[PDB]
Amino acid sequence: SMNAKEILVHSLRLLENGDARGWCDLFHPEGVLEYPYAPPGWKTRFEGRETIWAHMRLHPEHVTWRFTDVQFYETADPDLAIGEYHGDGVVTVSGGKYAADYITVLRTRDGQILLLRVFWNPLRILEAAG
């Protein structure tokens, strides 16, 4: 099955497709999603596939995303990936823009995600959403 880097690039393509169900299905049932720099007001951790789903569920209808090519650092374990990439987000009703630079840590096992730890600058969110 897929290694961490192939799962990251496939997870991004899923999001660009609006396919939240499939994105969430990549996680291990006890999969963890983390936003370590999220703003106060926001949860920085979502434990378990269903919890991640309950958060991601709602957004494809309202915002869509396009990511540049991931550049990966060379980790020793093929079940760990660490990557940098740029996302542009578009709010579907207004044409409102998000622009973000990520560095993301991904731990996989047997094709499923145990941990997706997604860093980005929460100023990018406060400027676009307030």
Ligand X SMILES: C[C@]12CC[C@H](O)C[C@H]1CC[C@@H]1[C@@H]2C[C@@H](O)[C@]2(C)[C@@H](C3=CC(=O)OC3)CC[C@]12O
Q: Which among 24-32, 45-53, 70-78, 100-108 is the span making contact with ligand X, rule CB under 6 A?
A: 100-108
Handedness of CA 13, 7, 43, 58 (dihedral sign): positive
Asked if 119 touches ligand X (CB under 6 A), the answer is no
Q: Does 104 bind ligand X (CB under 6 A)?
A: yes
Instruction: Extract the runs of DSSP E, i.e. beta strands, from 7-48.
Output: 27-34, 45-47
For residue 1, the minimal CB distance to ligand X (Å) is 20
- The verdict on 118 binding ligand X (CB under 6 A) reads yes
Region binding ligand X by CB under 6 A among candidate stretches 45-53, 72-80, 107-115, 118-126: 118-126
Q: Backbone phi, then psi, for 5, in 5-degree steps?
A: -70, -40
SS3 74: coil
